[PDB]
Design an enzyme around this catalytic site. Structure first.
Site, PDB file in Angstrom:
ATOM      1  N   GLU A 114       0.650  -1.355   0.178  1.00  0.00           N
ATOM      2  CA  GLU A 114       0.003  -0.057   0.021  1.00  0.00           C
ATOM      3  C   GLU A 114       0.831   1.397   0.058  1.00  0.00           C
ATOM      4  O   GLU A 114       1.790   1.349   0.661  1.00  0.00           O
ATOM      5  CB  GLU A 114      -0.953   0.046   1.208  1.00  0.00           C
ATOM      6  N   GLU A 143     -11.531  -3.751  -2.100  1.00  0.00           N
ATOM      7  CA  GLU A 143     -11.081  -5.029  -1.722  1.00  0.00           C
ATOM      8  C   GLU A 143     -11.681  -5.000  -0.041  1.00  0.00           C
ATOM      9  O   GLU A 143     -12.447  -3.987   0.189  1.00  0.00           O
ATOM     10  CB  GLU A 143      -9.588  -5.220  -1.326  1.00  0.00           C
TER      11      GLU A 143
END
Ligand SMILES: OC[C@H]1O[C@H](O[C@H]2[C@H](O)[C@@H](O)[C@@H](O)O[C@@H]2CO)[C@H](O)[C@@H](O)[C@@H]1O
Ligand SMILES: OC[C@H]1O[C@H](O[C@H]2[C@H](O)[C@@H](O)[C@@H](O)O[C@@H]2CO)[C@H](O)[C@@H](O)[C@@H]1O
Ligand SMILES: OC[C@H]1O[C@H](O[C@H]2[C@H](O)[C@@H](O)[C@H](O)O[C@@H]2CO)[C@H](O)[C@@H](O)[C@@H]1O
Ligand SMILES: OC[C@H]1O[C@H](O)[C@H](O)[C@@H](O)[C@@H]1O
Ligand SMILES: [Ca+2]
Length: 516
Positions: free
Chosen positions: A172, A367
């Site tokens: 991320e 997600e």
């Protein structure tokens, strides 16, 4: 969906592979069968992490793509598609991790200073991923890795539907502000990660570049710094989050801090496109974390996001559009709480990120943050995914639905849908000057009976005097819906007499005609 629209016609469901290599979980034959089964339930492709620690372990330029190749071979055998994640971050140490794959140990030797890693407000060192400040090492290493990967995976370009990049910890784009060893694990406030000597001087030089001299700095910050060495990141992260962030200094510090991530995004985006565009011609994307805790903490507002590097999401997303990277967000399965002590507002966060993404024209993919164990959470995902224009949803993780037939069956029904365009036609509607007709239905794809935010707008056909519109619907699913009239002021005037249905929506484009 939002703004009178319907679900995204390009929607596709993805399955996140295990963290461990397939051979450490089962055998390739069973795996190929698991993929055929997944495909039967609506999954378009399997996304998988290819660890840097595995592909360049031995030393610089000593590559090993044998696993990635074997994996792609089985995906091809199963007749599926894969989405590789070039995970240049460490596996293990984060929530849900069940692996131990650090980045190549040799990378740390390419520098004598402390430009490569992170150091928190309190000295905690972090080596989960290369510090984006070291753009010179990142350009070299990621540049080489990506191009090597492209060559080695060229033979499989036909099964690669997309390529993901790792912009930081857990893949991320962010700073490692919430970790156990730093005492910043959920739901604690995060700690800034710019305390290495390298980070300090970089901020100092950035401030001086912006203002020219210490005097101009002191003038802008309304401060009285004695010397250039006094230009520093926050000494007290807590106090900074409580109110220091409101000052001219705070704004500059946060601008620089988030800036590093934006510059990093543009860099990896460029290296990636240069390495894959001609060879694969597939979309490239990165992930933004869902740091939903401490969101509405009155004392330290956004106390977990800011240290992670998220101060201005609008500005952050511009870097993505600029770099030509699709964006993936998480927490689609969660709901708001916003109460002491977590002050968690995941849904509000997802909505804001989605709204911004759609405005800038950025492809949005979602997600779930944690594993899903009940049909109810799939519904929450469906609501967000199908009403905020998500082009894709990736379910974490593999085993959750592969070894649970009933859960898998629920995912197929609610999320493994194939979007199909259909024409809805409503006749004999008693509309008056200024009224607009909409349709709302039982499934999330139809706004779940919501007439305020998610209804789907229809258009008047002056020629046949009826209302119609091409709406995207879930193929082969049963649906119920009703048209309704919205007054010029926005209130629901009346509803269609009889509730309509389509059992199920055909997979071929046709039309459903009904009377008011
Ligand atoms: O480089 C200037 C100064 O920055 C920091 O102090 C900030 C503080 O972090 C903010 O919360 C707010 O109080 O403004 C201060 C600057 O006036 C560092 O803590 C300090 O060491 C440094 O000199
Ligand atoms: O709000 C959920 C509810 O919506 C619809 O009910 C409508 C009904 O169709 C209208 O004729 C009028 O009575 O307003 C209702 C909303 O309060 C669905 O028909 C129904 O199945 C659903 O539960
Ligand atoms: O396999 C993909 C990544 O999975 C984990 O990270 C997830 C995390 O589990 C989830 O809670 C969060 O919301 O998103 C991240 C990123 O998808 C692993 O920790 C990562 O290393 C993997 O790349
Ligand atoms: O910090 C990692 C995790 O912490 C908590 O478990 C949160 O509920 C989850 O959303 C997050 O991914
Ligand atoms: Ca290299």
């Amino acid at each position: 969906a939002v703004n009178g629209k319907g679900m995204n016609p390009d929607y596709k469901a993805y399955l996140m592979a295990p963290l461990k290599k397939i051979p450490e979980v089962t055998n390739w034959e069973t795996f190929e069968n698991d993929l055929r089964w997944a495909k039967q339930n609506g999954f378009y492709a399997i996304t998988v992490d290819f660890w840097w620690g595995d592909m360049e372990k031995n030393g610089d330029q000593q590559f090993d793509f044998s696993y990635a190749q074997r994996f792609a071979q089985s995906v091809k055998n199963a007749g599926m598609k894969m989405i590789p994640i070039i995970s240049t971050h460490q596996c293990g140490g984060n929530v849900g991790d069940d692996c131990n794959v650090p980045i190549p140990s040799w990378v740390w030797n390419q520098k004598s200073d402390d430009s490569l890693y992170f150091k928190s407000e309190t000295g905690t060192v972090n080596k989960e991923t290369l510090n984006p400040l070291a753009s010179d090492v990142i350009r070299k290493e990621y540049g080489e890795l990506y191009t090597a990967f492209a060559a080695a995976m060229k033979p499989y370009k036909d099964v690669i539907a997309k390529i993901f990049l790792s912009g930081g910890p857990a893949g991320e784009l962010r700073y490692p502000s919430y970790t156990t060893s730093d005492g910043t694990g959920y739901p604690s406030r995060g700690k800034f990660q710019a305390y290495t000597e390298f980070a300090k001087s970089k901020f100092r030089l950035w401030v001086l570049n912006k203002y020219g001299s210490l005097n101009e700095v002191n003038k802008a910050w309304g401060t009285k710094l004695i010397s250039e060495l006094a230009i520093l990141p926050p000494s007290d992260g807590e106090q900074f989050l409580m109110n220091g962030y409101l000052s001219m200094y705070g704004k500059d510090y946060l601008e620089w801090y988030q800036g590093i991530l934006e510059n990093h995004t543009k860099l990896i985006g460029e290296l990636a496109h240069n390495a894959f565009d001609t060879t694969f011609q597939v979309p490239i994307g990165a992930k933004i974390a869902g740091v939903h805790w401490q969101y509405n903490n009155p004392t330290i507002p956004h106390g977990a996001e800011k240290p992670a590097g998220y101060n201005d999401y609008s500005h952050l997303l511009d870097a993505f559009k600029s770099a030509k990277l699709d964006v993936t967000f998480t927490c689609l399965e969660m709901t708001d709480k916003g109460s002491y002590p977590e002050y968690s507002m995941p849904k509000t966060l997802v909505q804001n990120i989605a709204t911004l993404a759609n405005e800038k024209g950025i492809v949005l993919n979602g997600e779930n943050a944690l594993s899903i164990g009940n049909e109810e959470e799939y519904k929450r995902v469906a609501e967000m995914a199908f009403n905020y224009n998500f082009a894709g949803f990736t379910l974490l993780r593999y085993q959750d639905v592969m070894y649970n037939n009933s859960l898998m069956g629920k995912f197929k029904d609610l999320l493994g849908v194939t979007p199909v365009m259909q024409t809805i036609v409503v006749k004999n509607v008693p509309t008056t000057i200024g009224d607009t007709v909409y349709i709302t239905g039982n499934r999330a794809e139809l706004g779940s009976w919501d007439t305020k935010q998610y209804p789907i707008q229809l258009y008047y056909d002056s020629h046949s005097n009826d209302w119609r519109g091409n709406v995207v619907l879930p193929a082969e699913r049963n649906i119920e819906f009703k048209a309704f009239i919205k007054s010029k002021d926005g209130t629901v005037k009346s509803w269609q007499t009889i509730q309509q249905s389509w059992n199920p929506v055909p997979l071929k484009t046709t039309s459903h005609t009904s009377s008011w």
